[PDB]
Ligand binder design. Sequence first.
Ligand SMILES: O=C(O)[C@H](O)[C@H](O)[C@H](O)COP(=O)(O)O
Ligand SMILES: O=C(O)[C@H](O)[C@H](O)[C@H](O)COP(=O)(O)O
Lengths: 156, 156
Amino acid sequence: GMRVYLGADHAGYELKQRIIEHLKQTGHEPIDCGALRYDADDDYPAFCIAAATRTVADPGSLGIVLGGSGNGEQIAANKVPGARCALAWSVQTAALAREHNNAQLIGIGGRMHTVAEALAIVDAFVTTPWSKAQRHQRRIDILAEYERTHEAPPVP
Amino acid sequence: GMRVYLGADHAGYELKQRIIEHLKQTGHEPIDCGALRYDADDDYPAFCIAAATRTVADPGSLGIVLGGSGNGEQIAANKVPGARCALAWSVQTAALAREHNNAQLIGIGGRMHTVAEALAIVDAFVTTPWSKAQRHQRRIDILAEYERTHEAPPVP
Ligand SMILES: O=C(O)[C@H](O)[C@H](O)[C@H](O)COP(=O)(O)O
Ligand SMILES: O=C(O)[C@H](O)[C@H](O)[C@H](O)COP(=O)(O)O
């Protein structure tokens, strides 16, 4: 049972609403950050920053942000302090985003998948645990430290 | 043109060396930020932050960051102020990254493609122009302002 914050522009709006329904059906708690209706001209950043900000502030939660490709949306979510947003374009990448990257959010492209494919990506994301493996935590900590100071760490 | 900054961990290392060779052959100037050798245990953030920082600082340059999926790498690159790093998993997504998101960088997963698929992705990325269309520029500006202030833009 996961709480999931969702954000989308117009290009991801229709898939977002379908995902919200699916998440309800499969025992989860979706929270819609908008867009709340289709608006052809609307701008992705606000919705993605909102979902990402709320996700980071609510530990244990996850997030999903949607656009055409999903890339603008993961980019915007990733600007939020503490947020790690993968682009999920397959079951495997959704799974690995959790397992390796402890990603609290994924971006999905509404123009990229069938509904069946998208929901499969969503299922993998909400059910795959974070592995807690040492090397992954080490890498996440390194990135977290860069985010704290914006001082580029030295390369080997 | 052009200068292309490459960063990879061990999981994207062999693909990175292949991409560098390909970019030389296609008339570009690849710049290797590391890893310079295969180290099975190495940590992606430093290489990706290096690539992203150098790309954002170098007008007209692009950047490519590689890992297993590419997702930890685009996340790290996106923590760099001013950087927009998409995850490119196809020719279409590489092209749209440039066209819509004006991404200076893409992440590619070394575990996700054949070399031929990966090089097609690279070609699309380095040859597809930024559209300069109004709505895309507006969205990038909104994100840049959030990076500047951390004031979450209002949701409609
Ligand atoms: O993920 C994406 O494809 C992006 O961030 C936007 O959704 C896309 O540029 C919208 O394109 P539009 O509907 O404005 O043509
Ligand atoms: O792009 C990704 O797959 C990630 O950021 C790392 O490359 C991945 O977790 C490395 O996995 P490892 O080789 O340590 O199993």
